[PDB]
Amino acid sequence: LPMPMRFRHLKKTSKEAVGVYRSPIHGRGLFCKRNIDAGEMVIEYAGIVIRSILTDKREKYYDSKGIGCYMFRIDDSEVVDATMHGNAARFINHSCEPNCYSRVINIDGQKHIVIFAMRKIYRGEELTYDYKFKLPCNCGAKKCRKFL
Ligand SMILES: Nc1ncnc2c1ncn2[C@@H]1O[C@H](CN(CC[C@H](N)C(=O)O)CC2CN(Cc3cccs3)C2)[C@@H](O)[C@H]1O
Numbered sequence: 001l002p003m004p005m006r007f008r009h010l011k012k013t014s015k016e017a018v019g020v021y022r023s024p025i026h027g028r029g030l031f032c033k034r035n036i037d038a039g040e041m042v043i044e045y046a047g048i049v050i051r052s053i054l055t056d057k058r059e060k061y062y063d064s065k066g067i068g069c070y071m072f073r074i075d076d077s078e079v080v081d082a083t084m085h086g087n088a089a090r091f092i093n094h095s096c097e098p099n100c101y102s103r104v105i106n107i108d109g110q111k112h113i114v115i116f117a118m119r120k121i122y123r124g125e126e127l128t129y130d131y132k133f134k135l136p137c138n139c140g141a142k143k144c145r146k147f148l
């Protein structure tokens with residue numbers, strides 16, 4: 001189906017497809033509640049598209065209030081701040097053998113970060129994507145890069 005058609009009514013279907021639980025990779029993670037077909041649009045990384053130059057001061061503010069800072073870097077100029085207006089996608093952990101990938105899509109003039117299933121994902125599995133950004137990696141994959 002064309003990309004703009006696939007983006008419509010994710011809020012309703014993502015509440016039934018995924019859930020947030022403790023993760024053995026790190027803290028909390030996103031897990032699937034039912035089998036997700038390969039190529040399927042899982043969830044949007046919801047939040048506010050902000051200027052990248054403002055992330056340093058925004059993260060400093062959040063850290064000073066004891067509020068966890070959830071951000072997804074679009075490019076050198078833009079970042080999605082999911083701290084206040086986010087959804088369950090903000091808990092997606094990194095893996096060197098991910099079952100998901102991130103993409104910046106443009107729907108009716110507006111930018112959205114969406115998560116796609118790279119293979120069929122089975123009930124109970126944690127959803128992961130490759131983070132592009134040393135920090136030690138705990139994905140546990142055979143072909144682990146050992147750092148994020
Ligand atoms: N494969 C990995 N191996 C090791 N560490 C990982 C991996 N993959 C995600 N990580 C960590 O997770 C952060 C990305 N986070 C994803 C969700 C996280 N699991 C959460 O519970 O909130 C979001 C940031 C915001 N921080 C809030 C905090 C809660 C507790 C301590 S800090 C976590 C990353 O920057 C890392 O520090």
Ligand SMILES: [Zn+2]
Pocket residue numbers: 095096097137138139140141143144145146147
């Ligand atoms: Zn890894």
